[PDB]
């Protein structure tokens, strides 16, 4: 019965190690998403500016 408790705890340690590295990968992705999403926002604003600018010139 004691052996089975040593066997069990080992599995749940790996559950945490996987849990941490899985959340750690997603954590890095998050920053990337927010980096570019801003850059795309910057692009679209500039896009709309030309769109009306070119009209108001003509």
């Amino acid at each position: 019965d004691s052996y089975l408790k040593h066997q069990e705890i080992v599995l749940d340690t790996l559950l945490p190690q996987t849990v941490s590295n899985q959340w750690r990968i997603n954590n890095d992705y998050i920053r990337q998403t927010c980096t570019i999403v801003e850059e795309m926002n910057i692009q679209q604003r500039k896009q709309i500016n030309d769109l009306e600018i070119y009209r108001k010139r003509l």
């Binding site: 069990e8 790996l14 559950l15 996987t18 899985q22």
Partner: protein
């Protein structure tokens, strides 16, 4: 029939004495086994 009587009476006493002590420890040991089967199934989904 003497043996069957003598032996199986001893067996039933040895069994029920063990069972009383060991059915509790079986449940202890068997409910722990079920924890491996869930500790494994989560392990794979996290690895995946």
């Amino acid at each position: 029939r003497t043996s069957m009587k003598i032996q199986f009476k001893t067996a039933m006493p040895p069994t029920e004495v063990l069972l009383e002590s060991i059915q509790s420890k079986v449940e202890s040991i068997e409910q722990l086994q079920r924890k491996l089967q869930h500790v494994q199934p989560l392990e794979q989904q996290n690895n995946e």
